[PDB]
Amino acid sequence: AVTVDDLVEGIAFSITHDSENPNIVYLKSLMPSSYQVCWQHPQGRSQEREVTLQMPFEGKYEVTFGVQTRGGIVYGNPATFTIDSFCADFV
């Protein structure tokens, strides 16, 4: 079964700023598509494999990636991302 130490950014999942607008952040599962996944992120919870976040406010943010197993959901340690400047469009 998958463990906490498996659930590492760059391996089990990725977090990426949009190349054109860095206030857009893409959460993506790198697990096989048949895996049930779970995200805890700055606007709550999502079980979609790919999640888009539009973050208007400058700040430091956490994202936790979880994977459904036989024994319930296993969550990795939180990853962080930062938003460097304010984007009024996303308010």
Side-chain angles (χ1 to χ4, degrees), residues 27 37-41 44-51:
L27 319 183
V37 304
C38 187
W39 299 96
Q40 290 169 9
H41 54 62
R45 177 178 156 98
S46 172
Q47 76 172 64
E48 278 64 56
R49 287 186 294 273
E50 298 187 45
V51 173

Side-chain angles (χ1 to χ4, degrees), residues 6-14 28-31 39 65 67:
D6 292 328
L7 298 189
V8 173
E9 181 187 2
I11 296 183
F13 67 96
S14 71
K28 181 179 167 52
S29 165
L30 305 178
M31 306 296 295
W39 299 96
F65 181 75
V67 175

Side-chain angles (χ1 to χ4, degrees), residues 11-74:
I11 296 183
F13 67 96
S14 71
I15 302 172
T16 313
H17 294 267
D18 182 272
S19 63
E20 298 222 275
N21 184 352
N23 292 65
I24 306 169
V25 175
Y26 305 114
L27 319 183
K28 181 179 167 52
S29 165
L30 305 178
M31 306 296 295
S33 58
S34 58
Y35 276 78
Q36 211 146 352
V37 304
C38 187
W39 299 96
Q40 290 169 9
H41 54 62
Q43 51 190 33
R45 177 178 156 98
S46 172
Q47 76 172 64
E48 278 64 56
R49 287 186 294 273
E50 298 187 45
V51 173
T52 302
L53 309 174
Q54 293 182 358
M55 297 288 100
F57 304 117
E58 181 177 357
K60 190 179 157 181
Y61 301 95
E62 295 193 348
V63 169
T64 297
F65 181 75
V67 175
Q68 180 82 53
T69 79
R70 211 178 104 85
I73 303 183
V74 171

